[PDB]
């Protein structure tokens, strides 16, 4: 049994016609203190998988080391490590899901909420969730922590069910992700303006975007608001 | 008298370990393998005796990788060579876990050296029937 110290907020993700998009901000909060601002919370495994981790940062760094060891272990005595026997998004998730459930069963959990985003070898989109309890689920849109309450309602307006996926392009999907990051910056007190975005497509491959900022913010209406009820000036 | 060559850890009258020398005979019987150090790296090469046309070409890989920067090739008892690489892979992973940086080649060389030397100290274990050529690129 432990308690989270340095933490990372929401990880948001959705799937479109050709692949998946995942995003997370660069903040490492120390309680109410916004301590660290250079924290990458999206971990790319190979060129077909990106792992987005929220929660305890020290546990995230442990998982990050486990993923790097998984790549090293897979290449051992494997001539097709970059071809047929390469690490699939499904292999990477199932391993993490096993570790997460084993740790909670030993009453010493990894304090994290993890979303594995990627494209399978046959071209199928992969998007699955796993938390500190070992609870796993799949949905067209997935979001951790605060994003589950705010980003999901916005992302489900684009892809409500499975049939909406082939109708959604990369441009529309990314627009919904960037918009959701702005809304999270509006209402989440543990969120940063700076964030990273990763696109895994079955055609263009992996596109990792760094140092993205929340733009086009509405604040002008604040000048017209004065007092809390009866005050006029 | 005689019988000094029956047990592993036993010193002969002339200060020799015959069981180790007998393991060298298993290496000399084995396939030829080489290693060439160049200006900024190393090159490993090995012979692969085709026993019959039934052997699938380019499949029975002999050269092995330790970590992501070390290459290993050996001559003699192939299963013994694989056992040594497995130990080296565990030894390299232990170094990276504690020190963050990938294991230096001279550091990795001693780790295999101490492990092989250990198999010459007891009569309950057999010496390795392999001579391993290995190396790679590190900090310097």
XYZ file of C-alpha atoms in Angstrom:
373
model
C 0.000 0.000 0.000
C 1.350 3.395 -1.079
C 0.325 6.968 -1.930
C 1.010 8.980 -5.127
C 3.514 11.833 -4.717
C 4.471 13.352 -8.088
C 1.487 12.957 -10.425
C 0.396 13.420 -14.046
C -3.167 14.334 -15.052
C -5.465 13.152 -17.906
C -4.420 11.056 -20.901
C -6.901 11.393 -23.783
C -7.247 9.200 -26.889
C -9.544 8.291 -29.801
C -9.535 6.172 -32.976
C -10.174 7.316 -36.556
C -10.500 5.568 -39.957
C -6.790 4.748 -40.391
C -5.421 4.729 -36.825
C -5.348 6.305 -33.360
C -4.491 9.643 -31.709
C -3.252 10.015 -28.110
C -2.383 13.131 -26.061
C -1.093 14.081 -22.592
C 0.268 17.296 -21.049
C 3.826 17.824 -19.782
C 3.047 18.469 -16.097
C 4.353 16.693 -12.989
C 2.316 17.968 -10.044
C 3.459 17.781 -6.418
C 0.071 17.979 -4.695
C -1.236 21.473 -5.439
C 2.246 22.612 -6.514
C 2.893 22.474 -10.264
C 6.499 21.366 -9.792
C 7.774 19.854 -13.062
C 7.045 21.065 -16.608
C 9.350 18.901 -18.753
C 7.641 15.540 -18.234
C 6.893 13.400 -21.293
C 3.990 11.104 -20.391
C 3.616 9.468 -23.820
C 6.030 6.554 -24.280
C 6.475 5.250 -27.850
C 7.229 1.517 -28.030
C 8.612 0.718 -31.485
C 6.911 2.521 -34.374
C 3.405 1.058 -34.024
C 2.575 1.696 -30.341
C 2.394 4.677 -27.963
C 1.759 4.224 -24.225
C 0.098 7.092 -22.326
C 0.496 6.952 -18.545
C -1.195 9.070 -15.865
C -0.769 9.103 -12.076
C 2.400 8.459 -10.061
C 5.462 9.621 -12.035
C 7.979 7.410 -10.184
C 5.828 4.402 -11.113
C 5.607 5.730 -14.695
C 9.422 5.797 -14.878
C 9.421 2.175 -13.672
C 6.954 1.139 -16.373
C 9.014 3.129 -18.906
C 12.040 0.992 -17.973
C 9.969 -2.213 -18.269
C 8.913 -1.250 -21.808
C 12.528 -0.583 -22.843
C 13.488 -3.995 -21.435
C 10.615 -5.576 -23.390
C 12.093 -4.239 -26.654
C 15.561 -5.541 -25.706
C 14.171 -8.957 -24.694
C 12.114 -9.319 -27.894
C 15.174 -8.761 -30.109
C 17.083 -11.610 -28.408
C 17.496 -14.628 -30.731
C 14.895 -13.089 -33.052
C 15.883 -12.428 -36.705
C 12.401 -11.013 -37.398
C 12.393 -8.506 -34.509
C 11.758 -5.668 -36.982
C 9.378 -7.657 -39.218
C 6.874 -10.430 -38.370
C 7.896 -10.977 -34.733
C 7.873 -7.268 -33.826
C 6.072 -6.026 -30.702
C 2.342 -5.571 -31.315
C 0.219 -3.023 -29.375
C -1.789 -6.016 -28.099
C 1.350 -7.758 -26.774
C 2.496 -4.601 -24.976
C -0.905 -3.990 -23.350
C -1.478 -7.583 -22.184
C 1.945 -7.548 -20.495
C 1.182 -4.277 -18.682
C -2.320 -5.502 -17.759
C -0.760 -8.624 -16.208
C 1.722 -6.538 -14.175
C -0.983 -4.089 -13.012
C -3.274 -6.883 -11.766
C -0.437 -8.839 -10.107
C 0.669 -5.754 -8.153
C -2.858 -5.005 -6.871
C -3.212 -8.667 -5.832
C -0.027 -8.305 -3.760
C -1.474 -5.089 -2.237
C 1.402 -3.037 -3.690
C -0.076 -1.363 -6.796
C 1.508 0.772 -9.504
C -0.485 3.984 -9.025
C -1.287 4.554 -12.685
C -3.995 4.732 -15.333
C -2.598 3.549 -18.669
C -3.933 3.781 -22.234
C -2.196 1.726 -24.933
C -2.678 3.250 -28.394
C -1.442 1.639 -31.608
C -2.034 -0.133 -34.916
C -1.849 -3.932 -35.264
C 0.168 -5.708 -37.991
C -3.001 -6.317 -40.044
C -3.986 -2.628 -39.847
C -6.529 -2.853 -37.018
C -6.724 0.011 -34.512
C -5.791 -0.800 -30.912
C -7.054 1.268 -27.979
C -7.330 -0.270 -24.505
C -7.229 0.957 -20.889
C -5.651 -0.475 -17.716
C -5.501 1.037 -14.203
C -3.992 0.357 -10.751
C -6.792 -2.142 -10.015
C -6.127 -4.087 -13.228
C -9.492 -3.096 -14.722
C -9.389 -3.264 -18.532
C -11.780 -1.961 -21.220
C -11.929 -0.851 -24.878
C -13.901 2.015 -26.437
C -13.724 4.234 -29.576
C -12.631 7.019 -27.192
C -10.624 6.581 -23.980
C -9.538 9.090 -21.326
C -7.983 8.849 -17.847
C -8.845 10.744 -14.652
C -10.240 14.206 -15.350
C -10.435 13.611 -19.115
C -12.967 10.824 -18.550
C -15.480 13.445 -17.377
C -14.773 16.263 -19.819
C -12.887 15.043 -22.906
C -14.942 11.854 -23.416
C -18.286 13.703 -23.850
C -16.628 15.883 -26.520
C -14.852 13.007 -28.290
C -17.989 10.818 -28.290
C -19.767 13.573 -30.248
C -17.418 12.718 -33.135
C -17.339 8.921 -32.682
C -20.438 7.768 -30.782
C -20.257 4.113 -31.859
C -18.143 1.681 -33.923
C -19.707 2.712 -37.260
C -18.568 6.340 -36.821
C -14.872 5.340 -36.896
C -14.475 4.836 -40.692
C -16.304 8.162 -41.202
C -13.782 10.132 -39.108
C -10.663 11.568 -40.782
C -7.305 12.480 -39.184
C -8.083 16.212 -39.469
C -11.417 15.962 -37.614
C -10.013 13.553 -34.996
C -6.982 15.735 -34.168
C -9.196 18.844 -34.005
C -11.370 17.120 -31.377
C -8.267 16.091 -29.396
C -6.728 19.602 -29.435
C -10.098 21.130 -28.448
C -10.423 18.673 -25.541
C -6.953 19.674 -24.290
C -8.114 23.312 -24.203
C -11.234 22.409 -22.182
C -9.051 20.401 -19.777
C -6.772 23.439 -19.376
C -9.879 25.537 -18.655
C -11.357 23.461 -15.823
C -8.607 21.162 -14.474
C -6.449 22.755 -11.764
C -3.679 20.170 -12.259
C -3.230 20.746 -16.008
C -0.527 22.389 -18.138
C -0.787 24.472 -21.319
C 2.077 22.525 -22.925
C 1.327 19.011 -24.205
C 2.434 16.203 -26.532
C 0.392 14.513 -29.270
C 0.997 11.185 -31.027
C -0.658 9.864 -34.194
C -0.304 6.188 -35.131
C -1.538 5.599 -38.688
C -1.483 2.387 -40.745
C -0.131 4.369 -43.722
C 2.000 7.302 -42.493
C 3.266 5.390 -39.436
C 4.058 7.097 -36.132
C 3.966 10.895 -35.871
C 5.163 12.218 -32.506
C 4.426 15.915 -31.955
C 6.160 17.752 -29.095
C 5.814 21.167 -27.393
C 2.208 21.809 -28.483
C 0.342 24.645 -26.758
C -3.297 25.447 -26.012
C -4.257 28.269 -28.387
C -7.387 30.297 -29.274
C -8.542 30.857 -25.680
C -11.658 32.839 -24.741
C -11.022 35.166 -21.785
C -12.424 38.494 -22.982
C -15.778 37.978 -21.204
C -14.036 38.171 -17.794
C -13.866 41.992 -17.912
C -17.676 42.254 -17.901
C -17.967 40.131 -14.742
C -17.690 42.058 -11.462
C -18.662 41.098 -7.903
C -20.546 37.928 -6.964
C -24.171 39.119 -6.875
C -25.110 42.747 -6.223
C -21.840 44.626 -6.883
C -21.952 46.864 -9.974
C -18.417 48.305 -10.211
C 49.966 -41.259 -9.085
C 47.183 -40.839 -11.652
C 43.501 -39.857 -11.879
C 44.069 -36.093 -11.659
C 42.043 -35.644 -14.867
C 38.859 -37.279 -13.518
C 37.713 -34.463 -11.206
C 37.265 -30.803 -12.192
C 38.757 -28.681 -9.382
C 41.779 -30.973 -8.872
C 45.305 -29.647 -9.441
C 47.712 -32.008 -11.204
C 51.331 -32.459 -9.945
C 52.427 -29.823 -12.500
C 49.747 -27.312 -11.424
C 47.343 -27.932 -14.311
C 43.579 -28.419 -14.558
C 43.091 -31.248 -17.069
C 39.272 -31.052 -17.167
C 39.633 -27.473 -18.435
C 42.195 -28.606 -21.038
C 39.779 -31.385 -22.036
C 37.115 -28.705 -22.569
C 39.540 -26.900 -24.916
C 39.595 -30.079 -27.046
C 35.816 -29.718 -27.481
C 36.375 -26.143 -28.712
C 39.143 -27.136 -31.159
C 36.828 -29.806 -32.599
C 34.123 -27.163 -33.123
C 33.410 -24.772 -35.997
C 35.786 -21.872 -36.769
C 34.695 -18.339 -35.801
C 36.466 -14.957 -35.929
C 36.299 -11.341 -34.735
C 37.874 -8.229 -36.268
C 38.265 -4.912 -34.439
C 38.086 -1.990 -36.881
C 38.550 1.803 -36.615
C 35.195 2.507 -34.901
C 33.610 -0.919 -34.316
C 33.850 -4.718 -34.434
C 32.929 -7.411 -36.984
C 31.959 -10.994 -36.103
C 31.933 -13.914 -38.555
C 31.176 -17.642 -38.262
C 31.236 -20.802 -40.400
C 27.976 -22.784 -40.579
C 28.529 -26.408 -41.630
C 25.642 -27.492 -43.863
C 25.079 -31.118 -42.815
C 22.423 -31.742 -45.487
C 20.211 -29.955 -48.044
C 17.412 -30.351 -45.475
C 18.782 -27.459 -43.381
C 16.768 -24.298 -44.072
C 19.193 -21.566 -45.271
C 19.653 -18.357 -43.226
C 17.652 -19.754 -40.276
C 19.963 -21.479 -37.770
C 21.481 -18.260 -36.382
C 24.672 -18.767 -34.346
C 25.714 -15.176 -33.549
C 23.858 -13.729 -30.550
C 23.202 -10.208 -29.254
C 23.638 -9.141 -25.618
C 21.746 -5.969 -24.649
C 21.695 -3.784 -27.792
C 25.409 -3.127 -28.417
C 27.239 -6.385 -27.693
C 27.626 -9.243 -30.190
C 28.699 -12.768 -29.240
C 30.064 -15.687 -31.271
C 31.464 -19.000 -29.979
C 33.084 -22.285 -31.039
C 32.515 -25.782 -29.633
C 29.475 -26.964 -27.679
C 26.683 -24.690 -28.971
C 24.344 -25.328 -25.982
C 27.164 -24.241 -23.621
C 27.569 -21.037 -25.652
C 23.855 -20.247 -25.341
C 24.038 -20.746 -21.557
C 26.858 -18.219 -21.327
C 24.965 -15.641 -23.420
C 21.856 -16.107 -21.236
C 23.993 -15.322 -18.179
C 25.516 -12.325 -19.992
C 22.052 -11.017 -20.889
C 21.011 -11.233 -17.225
C 24.328 -9.651 -16.229
C 23.872 -6.762 -18.686
C 20.274 -6.172 -17.543
C 21.414 -6.077 -13.900
C 24.024 -3.414 -14.726
C 21.575 -1.208 -16.663
C 18.930 -1.487 -13.917
C 21.260 -0.075 -11.243
C 23.546 2.254 -13.231
C 21.159 3.413 -16.026
C 23.916 3.338 -18.687
C 24.409 0.201 -20.855
C 27.254 -2.060 -19.668
C 30.782 -1.199 -20.929
C 32.546 -3.927 -22.935
C 35.522 -4.330 -20.533
C 32.959 -4.447 -17.702
C 30.922 -7.105 -19.535
C 34.090 -9.089 -20.338
C 34.925 -9.522 -16.644
C 31.353 -10.595 -15.833
C 31.618 -13.537 -18.245
C 35.218 -14.107 -17.111
C 34.260 -14.467 -13.441
C 31.341 -16.757 -14.342
C 33.444 -19.136 -16.477
C 36.246 -19.147 -13.869
C 33.627 -20.155 -11.272
C 33.009 -23.405 -13.191
C 36.626 -24.427 -12.612
C 36.451 -24.179 -8.799
C 34.116 -27.116 -8.056
C 33.892 -30.826 -8.916
C 30.085 -30.550 -9.039
C 30.228 -28.400 -12.192
C 31.677 -28.930 -15.672
C 33.844 -26.328 -17.487
C 32.396 -24.548 -20.534
C 33.188 -26.246 -23.847
C 33.271 -22.915 -25.694
C 35.642 -20.092 -26.592
C 33.571 -16.930 -27.001
C 34.563 -13.979 -29.191
C 32.565 -10.886 -28.206
C 32.581 -7.073 -28.180
C 30.960 -3.774 -29.156
C 30.977 0.025 -28.868
C 30.639 1.926 -25.572
C 31.565 5.313 -24.025
C 35.185 5.164 -25.232
